[PDB]
Design an enzyme around this catalytic site. Structure first.
Site, PDB file in Angstrom:
ATOM      1  N   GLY A  47       0.866  -1.115   0.091  1.00 41.73           N
ATOM      2  CA  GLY A  47       0.024  -0.043  -0.036  1.00 41.73           C
ATOM      3  C   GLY A  47       0.873   1.350   0.053  1.00 41.73           C
ATOM      4  O   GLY A  47       0.662   2.192  -1.088  1.00 41.73           O
ATOM      5  N   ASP A  48       1.638   1.440   1.094  1.00 41.46           N
ATOM      6  CA  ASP A  48       2.553   2.652   1.102  1.00 41.46           C
ATOM      7  C   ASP A  48       3.881   2.763   1.019  1.00 41.46           C
ATOM      8  O   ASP A  48       4.698   3.532   1.031  1.00 41.46           O
ATOM      9  CB  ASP A  48       2.084   3.250   2.456  1.00 41.46           C
TER      10      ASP A  48
HETATM   11 MG   LIG Z   1      -0.619   2.601  -2.409  1.00 39.59          MG
HETATM   12 MG   LIG Z   2      -0.893   5.404   0.269  1.00 42.05          MG
HETATM   13 MG   LIG Z   3      -1.425   5.407   3.743  1.00 35.88          MG
END
Ligand SMILES: [Mg+2]
Ligand SMILES: [Mg+2]
Ligand SMILES: [Mg+2]
EC number: 3.1.-.-
Lengths: 152, 152
Positions: B18-19
DNA sequence: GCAAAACGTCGTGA
DNA sequence: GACAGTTTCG
DNA sequence: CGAAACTGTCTCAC
DNA sequence: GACGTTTTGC
Protein backbone atom coordinates in the site's frame (compact mmCIF):
# COMPACT_ATOMS: atom_id res chain seq x y z
CA UNK A 1 -21.80 -15.44 8.41
CA UNK A 2 -18.44 -15.75 6.62
CA UNK A 3 -15.26 -16.72 8.49
CA UNK A 4 -12.02 -15.32 7.08
CA UNK A 5 -8.55 -16.88 6.95
CA UNK A 6 -6.11 -15.22 9.40
CA UNK A 7 -3.34 -14.89 6.81
CA UNK A 8 -5.73 -12.99 4.54
CA UNK A 9 -6.78 -10.75 7.43
CA UNK A 10 -3.18 -10.00 8.49
CA UNK A 11 -2.14 -8.92 5.00
CA UNK A 12 -5.36 -7.01 4.45
CA UNK A 13 -5.05 -5.19 7.77
CA UNK A 14 -1.66 -3.91 6.64
CA UNK A 15 -3.00 -2.82 3.26
CA UNK A 16 -5.94 -1.08 4.96
CA UNK A 17 -3.71 0.75 7.42
CA UNK A 18 -1.88 1.88 4.29
CA UNK A 19 -4.47 2.68 1.60
CA UNK A 20 -7.80 1.82 3.20
CA UNK A 21 -10.30 4.07 4.94
CA UNK A 22 -12.81 3.43 7.73
CA UNK A 23 -15.39 6.19 7.34
CA UNK A 24 -18.31 7.44 9.43
CA UNK A 25 -20.57 10.19 8.15
CA UNK A 26 -23.70 12.08 9.14
CA UNK A 27 -25.58 12.87 5.93
CA UNK A 28 -28.40 15.42 5.99
CA UNK A 29 -31.43 13.79 4.37
CA UNK A 30 -34.97 14.98 5.05
CA UNK A 31 -36.44 11.52 4.50
CA UNK A 32 -34.94 10.39 7.80
CA UNK A 33 -36.47 10.53 11.28
CA UNK A 34 -33.77 12.88 12.59
CA UNK A 35 -33.14 14.51 9.22
CA UNK A 36 -29.77 12.76 8.88
CA UNK A 37 -28.48 9.34 7.91
CA UNK A 38 -25.71 7.62 9.85
CA UNK A 39 -23.47 6.28 7.10
CA UNK A 40 -20.59 3.84 7.54
CA UNK A 41 -18.14 2.76 4.89
CA UNK A 42 -15.06 0.54 4.64
CA UNK A 43 -13.06 1.18 1.50
CA UNK A 44 -9.77 0.45 -0.13
CA UNK A 45 -8.53 2.81 -2.82
CA UNK A 46 -6.17 1.92 -5.70
CA UNK A 47 -5.07 3.18 -9.12
CA UNK A 48 -7.49 1.81 -11.71
CA UNK A 49 -4.55 0.17 -13.45
CA UNK A 50 -4.56 -2.14 -10.39
CA UNK A 51 -8.33 -2.64 -10.21
CA UNK A 52 -7.62 -6.37 -10.32
CA UNK A 53 -6.55 -6.19 -6.68
CA UNK A 54 -9.89 -4.60 -5.77
CA UNK A 55 -11.96 -7.05 -7.84
CA UNK A 56 -10.07 -9.74 -5.93
CA UNK A 57 -11.22 -8.23 -2.63
CA UNK A 58 -14.80 -8.51 -3.86
CA UNK A 59 -14.29 -12.25 -4.40
CA UNK A 60 -12.23 -12.79 -1.24
CA UNK A 61 -14.46 -10.78 1.13
CA UNK A 62 -17.58 -12.12 -0.59
CA UNK A 63 -19.53 -8.87 -0.33
CA UNK A 64 -19.11 -5.29 -1.57
CA UNK A 65 -18.21 -3.86 -4.96
CA UNK A 66 -15.70 -1.74 -6.85
CA UNK A 67 -16.60 1.73 -8.02
CA UNK A 68 -14.71 3.54 -10.72
CA UNK A 69 -13.77 7.20 -10.53
CA UNK A 70 -11.38 7.56 -13.44
CA UNK A 71 -7.70 7.09 -12.70
CA UNK A 72 -8.64 5.66 -9.31
CA UNK A 73 -11.08 2.95 -8.14
CA UNK A 74 -12.39 1.85 -4.73
CA UNK A 75 -13.47 -1.38 -3.09
CA UNK A 76 -16.56 -0.37 -1.12
CA UNK A 77 -18.35 -2.16 1.70
CA UNK A 78 -21.31 -0.39 3.31
CA UNK A 79 -23.80 -3.16 4.14
CA UNK A 80 -24.06 -2.97 7.94
CA UNK A 81 -24.30 -6.70 8.67
CA UNK A 82 -21.34 -7.89 6.53
CA UNK A 83 -19.42 -4.80 7.63
CA UNK A 84 -19.74 -5.72 11.31
CA UNK A 85 -18.72 -9.33 10.64
CA UNK A 86 -15.72 -8.26 8.55
CA UNK A 87 -14.45 -5.47 10.82
CA UNK A 88 -14.84 -7.71 13.87
CA UNK A 89 -12.38 -10.14 12.28
CA UNK A 90 -10.02 -7.54 10.77
CA UNK A 91 -9.90 -5.28 13.85
CA UNK A 92 -7.35 -7.21 15.95
CA UNK A 93 -4.68 -6.93 13.22
CA UNK A 94 -5.04 -3.18 12.55
CA UNK A 95 -2.30 -0.89 13.94
CA UNK A 96 -3.27 2.52 12.59
CA UNK A 97 -7.03 2.26 12.14
CA UNK A 98 -7.96 -0.14 14.95
CA UNK A 99 -9.70 2.57 16.95
CA UNK A 100 -11.87 3.73 14.07
CA UNK A 101 -12.74 0.09 13.34
CA UNK A 102 -13.92 -0.40 16.91
CA UNK A 103 -15.88 2.84 16.92
CA UNK A 104 -17.65 1.66 13.77
CA UNK A 105 -18.55 -1.66 15.40
CA UNK A 106 -19.76 0.35 18.40
CA UNK A 107 -21.99 2.51 16.22
CA UNK A 108 -23.44 -0.46 14.31
CA UNK A 109 -24.45 -2.06 17.59
CA UNK A 110 -26.28 1.08 18.72
CA UNK A 111 -28.03 1.88 15.42
CA UNK A 112 -31.39 0.30 16.29
CA UNK A 113 -31.06 2.18 19.59
CA UNK A 114 -30.18 5.52 17.98
CA UNK A 115 -33.17 5.36 15.63
CA UNK A 116 -35.36 5.55 18.75
CA UNK A 117 -34.13 8.60 20.68
CA UNK A 118 -32.81 12.08 19.78
CA UNK A 119 -30.24 11.81 22.57
CA UNK A 120 -29.21 8.29 21.57
CA UNK A 121 -28.87 9.51 17.99
CA UNK A 122 -26.79 12.50 19.08
CA UNK A 123 -24.59 10.23 21.21
CA UNK A 124 -23.88 7.99 18.23
CA UNK A 125 -23.15 11.14 16.23
CA UNK A 126 -20.43 12.05 18.73
CA UNK A 127 -18.82 8.69 17.97
CA UNK A 128 -18.67 9.51 14.25
CA UNK A 129 -16.93 12.72 15.39
CA UNK A 130 -14.27 10.58 17.07
CA UNK A 131 -13.68 8.53 13.93
CA UNK A 132 -13.20 11.65 11.83
CA UNK A 133 -10.75 13.03 14.41
CA UNK A 134 -8.65 9.86 14.14
CA UNK A 135 -8.63 9.95 10.32
CA UNK A 136 -6.75 12.57 8.24
CA UNK A 137 -10.02 14.49 7.88
CA UNK A 138 -9.85 17.63 5.74
CA UNK A 139 -13.25 18.40 4.16
CA UNK A 140 -15.73 17.42 6.88
CA UNK A 141 -18.90 19.50 7.23
CA UNK A 142 -21.69 17.74 9.16
CA UNK A 143 -20.85 16.96 12.78
CA UNK A 144 -22.77 15.96 15.92
CA UNK A 145 -23.02 19.67 16.69
CA UNK A 146 -24.58 20.32 13.30
CA UNK A 147 -27.17 17.64 14.09
CA UNK A 148 -27.92 19.78 17.14
CA UNK A 149 -30.35 21.38 14.68
CA UNK A 150 -32.74 18.83 16.17
CA UNK A 151 -33.26 21.61 18.71
CA UNK A 152 -36.57 22.62 17.11
CA UNK B 1 20.69 -13.18 9.52
CA UNK B 2 17.60 -12.37 11.58
CA UNK B 3 14.43 -14.46 11.15
CA UNK B 4 11.21 -12.45 11.10
CA UNK B 5 7.85 -13.62 12.44
CA UNK B 6 5.42 -14.80 9.73
CA UNK B 7 2.47 -12.72 10.96
CA UNK B 8 4.73 -9.66 11.10
CA UNK B 9 5.72 -10.25 7.47
CA UNK B 10 2.10 -10.85 6.46
CA UNK B 11 0.95 -7.53 7.88
CA UNK B 12 4.00 -5.63 6.62
CA UNK B 13 3.70 -7.05 3.10
CA UNK B 14 0.21 -5.62 2.95
CA UNK B 15 1.36 -2.25 4.31
CA UNK B 16 4.28 -2.22 1.88
CA UNK B 17 2.04 -3.01 -1.07
CA UNK B 18 0.00 0.00 0.00
CA UNK B 19 2.43 2.70 1.18
CA UNK B 20 5.87 1.18 0.67
CA UNK B 21 8.22 1.32 -2.27
CA UNK B 22 10.85 -1.06 -3.64
CA UNK B 23 13.30 1.12 -5.55
CA UNK B 24 16.28 0.59 -7.85
CA UNK B 25 18.33 3.49 -9.17
CA UNK B 26 21.37 4.23 -11.30
CA UNK B 27 22.88 7.37 -9.81
CA UNK B 28 25.40 9.43 -11.78
CA UNK B 29 28.52 9.79 -9.67
CA UNK B 30 31.98 10.37 -11.14
CA UNK B 31 33.83 8.55 -8.34
CA UNK B 32 32.58 5.18 -9.59
CA UNK B 33 34.33 3.05 -12.21
CA UNK B 34 31.35 3.15 -14.57
CA UNK B 35 30.43 6.69 -13.52
CA UNK B 36 27.22 5.41 -11.92
CA UNK B 37 26.13 3.88 -8.61
CA UNK B 38 23.67 1.01 -8.41
CA UNK B 39 21.42 2.05 -5.53
CA UNK B 40 18.74 -0.17 -3.95
CA UNK B 41 16.15 1.06 -1.48
CA UNK B 42 13.27 -0.39 0.51
CA UNK B 43 11.12 2.28 2.11
CA UNK B 44 7.81 2.89 3.85
CA UNK B 45 6.37 6.41 3.78
CA UNK B 46 4.02 7.88 6.37
CA UNK B 47 2.77 11.23 7.66
CA UNK B 48 5.17 12.48 10.31
CA UNK B 49 2.48 12.57 13.00
CA UNK B 50 2.58 8.78 12.60
CA UNK B 51 6.38 8.55 12.71
CA UNK B 52 6.09 6.26 15.74
CA UNK B 53 4.96 3.52 13.36
CA UNK B 54 8.15 3.99 11.29
CA UNK B 55 10.35 4.10 14.41
CA UNK B 56 8.82 0.81 15.51
CA UNK B 57 9.77 -0.68 12.11
CA UNK B 58 13.39 0.15 12.77
CA UNK B 59 13.16 -1.88 15.98
CA UNK B 60 11.19 -4.76 14.45
CA UNK B 61 13.26 -5.07 11.28
CA UNK B 62 16.37 -4.40 13.36
CA UNK B 63 18.16 -2.33 10.74
CA UNK B 64 17.47 0.84 8.76
CA UNK B 65 16.44 4.31 9.89
CA UNK B 66 13.74 6.95 9.62
CA UNK B 67 14.26 10.23 7.86
CA UNK B 68 12.19 13.38 8.09
CA UNK B 69 11.12 15.43 5.08
CA UNK B 70 8.58 17.88 6.44
CA UNK B 71 5.02 16.70 6.93
CA UNK B 72 6.12 13.25 5.78
CA UNK B 73 8.72 10.73 7.02
CA UNK B 74 10.25 7.52 5.60
CA UNK B 75 11.68 4.31 6.92
CA UNK B 76 14.68 3.42 4.68
CA UNK B 77 16.67 0.27 4.33
CA UNK B 78 19.53 0.32 1.84
CA UNK B 79 22.21 -1.83 3.52
CA UNK B 80 22.55 -4.51 0.84
CA UNK B 81 23.01 -7.54 3.10
CA UNK B 82 20.14 -6.85 5.51
CA UNK B 83 18.03 -5.71 2.54
CA UNK B 84 18.56 -9.07 0.85
CA UNK B 85 17.68 -10.98 4.01
CA UNK B 86 14.59 -8.86 4.60
CA UNK B 87 13.19 -8.89 1.06
CA UNK B 88 13.83 -12.63 0.84
CA UNK B 89 11.42 -13.17 3.73
CA UNK B 90 8.91 -10.49 2.73
CA UNK B 91 8.68 -11.35 -0.97
CA UNK B 92 6.45 -14.43 -0.65
CA UNK B 93 3.65 -12.34 0.88
CA UNK B 94 3.76 -9.37 -1.50
CA UNK B 95 1.02 -9.07 -4.14
CA UNK B 96 1.69 -5.76 -5.88
CA UNK B 97 5.45 -5.44 -5.49
CA UNK B 98 6.52 -9.08 -5.40
CA UNK B 99 8.14 -8.76 -8.83
CA UNK B 100 10.02 -5.60 -7.87
CA UNK B 101 11.35 -7.37 -4.77
CA UNK B 102 12.58 -10.39 -6.71
CA UNK B 103 14.33 -8.14 -9.22
CA UNK B 104 16.09 -6.40 -6.34
CA UNK B 105 17.28 -9.72 -4.88
CA UNK B 106 18.51 -10.58 -8.37
CA UNK B 107 20.34 -7.26 -8.74
CA UNK B 108 21.95 -7.66 -5.31
CA UNK B 109 23.16 -11.17 -6.14
CA UNK B 110 24.72 -9.95 -9.39
CA UNK B 111 26.40 -6.80 -8.03
CA UNK B 112 29.84 -8.39 -7.52
CA UNK B 113 29.94 -9.71 -11.09
CA UNK B 114 28.53 -6.41 -12.35
CA UNK B 115 31.53 -4.56 -10.92
CA UNK B 116 33.57 -6.06 -13.78
CA UNK B 117 32.19 -6.62 -17.28
CA UNK B 118 30.98 -3.18 -18.47
CA UNK B 119 28.35 -5.14 -20.38
CA UNK B 120 27.34 -6.95 -17.20
CA UNK B 121 26.79 -3.55 -15.60
CA UNK B 122 24.42 -2.63 -18.43
CA UNK B 123 22.55 -5.90 -18.08
CA UNK B 124 22.00 -5.11 -14.41
CA UNK B 125 20.95 -1.58 -15.31
CA UNK B 126 18.36 -3.53 -17.30
CA UNK B 127 16.96 -5.17 -14.17
CA UNK B 128 16.59 -1.59 -12.94
CA UNK B 129 14.60 -0.56 -16.01
CA UNK B 130 12.21 -3.40 -15.23
CA UNK B 131 11.67 -2.35 -11.62
CA UNK B 132 10.95 1.23 -12.61
CA UNK B 133 8.51 -0.05 -15.24
CA UNK B 134 6.60 -1.98 -12.58
CA UNK B 135 6.40 1.02 -10.20
CA UNK B 136 4.33 4.17 -10.77
CA UNK B 137 7.45 5.91 -12.11
CA UNK B 138 6.91 9.51 -13.22
CA UNK B 139 10.17 11.45 -12.73
CA UNK B 140 12.88 8.97 -13.71
CA UNK B 141 15.81 10.66 -15.45
CA UNK B 142 18.80 8.31 -15.37
CA UNK B 143 18.22 5.02 -17.20
CA UNK B 144 20.43 2.27 -18.64
CA UNK B 145 20.23 4.08 -21.98
CA UNK B 146 21.93 6.90 -20.10
CA UNK B 147 24.59 4.52 -18.77
CA UNK B 148 25.11 3.54 -22.41
CA UNK B 149 27.44 6.56 -22.32
CA UNK B 150 30.08 4.04 -21.31
CA UNK B 151 30.92 4.18 -25.02
CA UNK B 152 34.38 5.77 -25.25
C1' DG C 1 -38.16 6.21 7.06
C1' DC C 2 -34.23 3.97 5.85
C1' DA C 3 -30.26 0.63 3.90
C1' DA C 4 -27.25 1.23 0.04
C1' DA C 5 -26.06 2.90 -4.06
C1' DA C 6 -24.32 6.36 -7.06
C1' DC C 7 -21.68 10.31 -8.15
C1' DG C 8 -18.42 14.34 -6.96
C1' DT C 9 -13.53 16.11 -5.82
C1' DC C 10 -10.78 18.31 -2.24
C1' DG C 11 -6.27 18.33 0.36
C1' DT C 12 -3.07 16.02 0.97
C1' DG C 13 0.01 11.72 2.40
C1' DA C 14 2.29 9.17 -0.18
C1' DG D 1 5.42 6.46 -3.99
C1' DA D 2 9.46 6.67 -6.82
C1' DC D 3 13.28 8.27 -8.07
C1' DA D 4 17.27 12.08 -8.57
C1' DG D 5 21.39 15.11 -6.54
C1' DT D 6 25.01 15.84 -2.91
C1' DT D 7 28.27 14.32 0.96
C1' DT D 8 30.57 11.21 4.01
C1' DC D 9 33.89 8.01 5.01
C1' DG D 10 36.58 3.36 5.12
C1' DC E 1 35.93 2.64 -5.79
C1' DG E 2 31.99 2.21 -3.57
C1' DA E 3 28.30 1.19 0.13
C1' DA E 4 25.42 3.88 2.40
C1' DA E 5 23.67 8.14 4.51
C1' DC E 6 22.17 13.05 3.82
C1' DT E 7 19.20 15.94 1.10
C1' DG E 8 15.60 17.40 -2.24
C1' DT E 9 11.17 17.02 -5.11
C1' DC E 10 7.68 15.49 -9.40
C1' DT E 11 2.95 14.13 -9.71
C1' DC E 12 0.05 12.19 -8.03
C1' DA E 13 -2.72 7.94 -5.81
C1' DC E 14 -4.61 8.06 -2.47
C1' DG F 1 -7.80 8.85 1.80
C1' DA F 2 -12.02 11.04 3.38
C1' DC F 3 -15.35 13.25 2.87
C1' DG F 4 -19.93 15.70 0.56
C1' DT F 5 -24.55 15.71 -1.91
C1' DT F 6 -28.20 13.32 -4.09
C1' DT F 7 -30.76 9.27 -5.74
C1' DT F 8 -32.68 4.40 -5.20
C1' DG F 9 -36.50 1.42 -4.15
C1' DC F 10 -38.17 -2.47 -0.69
MG1 LIG G 1 -0.65 2.65 -2.40
MG1 LIG H 1 -1.08 5.33 0.21
MG1 LIG I 1 -1.43 5.50 3.81
Amino acid sequence: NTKYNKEFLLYLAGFVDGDGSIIAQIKPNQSYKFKHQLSLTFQVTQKTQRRWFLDKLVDEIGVGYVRDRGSVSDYILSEIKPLHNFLTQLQPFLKLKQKQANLVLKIIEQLPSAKESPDKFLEVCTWVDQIAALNDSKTRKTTSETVRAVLD
